[PDB]
Design a protein around this ligand. Structure first.
Ligand SMILES: O=c1ncn(Cc2c(F)cc(F)cc2F)c2ccc(Oc3ccccc3C(F)(F)F)cc12
Ligand SMILES: [Mg+2]
Ligand SMILES: [Mg+2]
Length: 560
């Protein structure tokens, strides 16, 4: 069936949208070529639509069916609990889209009478009406990017009302948090932290006689998901031991929301219908990971690749396996792509076999190596810095709910570009404005969190280790990239940052307390007469456990 159907009403913006980076003092400090940084707007919606509207093709074979039963089997060991309206509410973000029935995130969190009552009514309705499609809103997502040798058209987000959103949590939160791990095991990418991911990738790579690996990029994965996929995905869920209320709630959510439904723009007009994955639902991240895994796993048996190992994060896939030769490997990869195409997961960029792990990119990131004080090789997770910086620049000029930079510092603490530019730029500013105290919301795997800037040293040591404060002698590959990028975005050179960092460091050490800590470990790279960085007290006390369990992108989740 057609992924989407449009009535002709436009996808409209519920306010004014900014497309160009504003010229201000602070941002200009990070990067000069501001006219290269832009943000998507509903304006390009039409273009997106054309890219995602098409008629799917799907042919399931015995390998598909086989793997499904295999996955079903493990899922059947799971027992998911129901969530009280409280727990679910406590999980809703404060910025989350307000309800169209008279309440908002604020009220939902305050367990406000009006909110909780409507929520209660929506649940009751999911238990009674098993048919009626649930209404959803469509919006052109507004993200920041850098220009390229045109521009990326806005991404479309589909999401139900806050009422239906809380119920989803109640019926499926526990499910989408445990089930994936139980089903995919070592392959579930969200169970790992950057360091743990790197470890998994490097161990897998080494466990092979002669490694071969590739990243498979599906063309607009969501729109490729078919009504069959969603139903199959629900069947896995149905294997869990669930309360009747939840069993039915899930059954209803599947038929009324997940497999598809009506599209309403911000104005309130009917835009069309959806028959593919909705990006703004709780089951998006879990569902896409299950689906992608299912297809790829079966696709590897069809293509006859040997000893496949998958790493899946939603629609993001990377496979590592035993090579069979250059020629044979390209044939297998091609076979693989076709199998996946049959399964309704055609490629965007044709996959290319990789024999050098550092060259494989998944989750917009890759694996590289640097050295610690002792001088031994240390692998860490890194990525091209363009987007992070561009957004960083944008987040410096305008106030925005989420701070991609803070999240990036956290996830990329050990990288060259993260420590040299981001850490400096932002600490320098916070130091100026006197804001080191204020907490800031950010995101990890799609879930919002609230971190205090002055706690970064602890976070970084526990998630990466002390080496993240002393790495050096980065690969010539990584170095070239960073430099190439700064040159492109008009970002100040190495020396300029060192000088700036050298100054911030000083200003930080004078304030003492948690600040000196930041200045001591975070900017130790700047001073020549180094300092001995020892295990930080608060580090071995942080409950970062929950930070890396499952994915929630688009799932409207906030871990308080
Ligand atoms: O391998 C390194 N080993 C150490 N340092 C010092 C250093 C560091 F260990 C971490 C850090 F957080 C900031 C730093 F300064 C480097 C500093 C810059 C660099 O790369 C470049 C070299 C020449 C020009 C431009 C660059 C650039 F844009 F940085 F890539 C490579 C290295
Ligand atoms: Mg895709
Ligand atoms: Mg974990």
């Amino acid at each position: 069936s057609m992924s989407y159907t449009w009535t002709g009403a436009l996808i409209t913006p519920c306010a004014a949208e900014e497309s160009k980076l504003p010229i201000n003092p602070l941002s200009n400090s990070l990067l000069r070529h501001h006219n290269m940084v832009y943000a998507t707007t509903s304006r390009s919606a039409s273009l997106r639509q054309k890219k995602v509207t098409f008629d799917r093709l799907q042919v399931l074979d015995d390998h598909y069916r086989d793997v499904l039963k295999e996955m079903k089997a493990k899922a059947s060991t799971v027992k998911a609990k129901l969530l009280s309206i409280e727990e679910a509410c406590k999980l809703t973000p404060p910025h989350s889209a307000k309800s169209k029935f008279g309440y908002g995130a604020k009220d939902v969190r305050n367990l406000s009478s009006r909110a909780v009552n409507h929520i209660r009514s929506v649940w009751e309705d999911l238990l009674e009406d098993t048919e009626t499609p649930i209404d959803t809103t469509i919006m052109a997502k507004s993200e920041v990017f850098c220009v390229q040798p045109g521009r990326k058209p806005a991404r479309l987000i589909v999401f139900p009302d806050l009422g239906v959103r809380v119920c989803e949590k109640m019926a499926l939160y526990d499910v989408v948090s445990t089930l994936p791990q139980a089903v995919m095991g070592s392959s579930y990418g969200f169970q790992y932290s950057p360091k743990q991911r790197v470890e998994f990738l490097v161990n897998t790579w080494k466990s092979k006689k002669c490694p071969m690996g590739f990243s498979y990029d599906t063309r607009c994965f969501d729109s490729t998901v078919t009504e069959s996929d969603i139903r199959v995905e629900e069947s896995i869920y149905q294997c869990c031991d669930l309360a009747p209320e939840a069993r039915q709630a899930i059954r209803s959510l599947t038929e009324r929301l997940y497999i598809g439904g009506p599209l309403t723009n911000s104005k309130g007009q009917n835009c069309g219908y959806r028959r593919c994955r909705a990006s703004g639902v709780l089951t998006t991240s879990c569902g896409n990971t299950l689906t992608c895994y299912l297809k790829a796993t079966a696709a590897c048996r069809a293509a006859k690749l040997q000893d496949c190992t998958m790493l899946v994060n939603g629609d993001d896939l990377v496979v590592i396996c035993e090579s069979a030769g250059t020629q044979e490997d390209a044939a297998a990869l091609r076979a693989f792509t076709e199998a996946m195409t049959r399964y309704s997961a055609p490629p965007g960029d044709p996959p290319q076999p990789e024999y050098d792990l550092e060259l494989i990119t998944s989750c917009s990131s890759n694996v590289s190596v640097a050295h610690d004080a002792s001088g031994k090789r240390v692998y860490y997770l890194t990525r091209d810095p363009t987007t992070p910086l561009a957004r960083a620049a944008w987040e410096t000029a305008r106030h925005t709910p989420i701070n991609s930079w803070l999240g990036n510092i956290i996830m990329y603490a050990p990288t060259l570009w993260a420590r040299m530019i981001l850490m400096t730029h932002f600490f320098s500013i916070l130091l100026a404005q006197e804001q080191l105290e204020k907490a800031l919301d950010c995101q990890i795997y799609g879930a919002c969190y609230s971190i205090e800037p002055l706690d970064l040293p602890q976070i970084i040591e526990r998630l990466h280790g002390l080496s993240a404060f002393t790495l050096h002698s980065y690969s010539p590959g990584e170095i070239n990239r960073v430099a190439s990028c700064l040159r492109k975005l008009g970002v100040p050179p190495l020396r300029t940052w060192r000088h700036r960092a050298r100054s911030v460091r000083a200003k930080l050490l004078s304030q003492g307390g948690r600040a000196a800590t930041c200045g001591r470990y975070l900017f130790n790279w700047a001073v020549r007469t180094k300092l001995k960085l020892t295990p930080i007290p608060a580090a071995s006390q942080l409950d970062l456990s929950g930070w890396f369990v499952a994915g929630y992108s688009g799932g409207d989740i906030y871990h308080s």
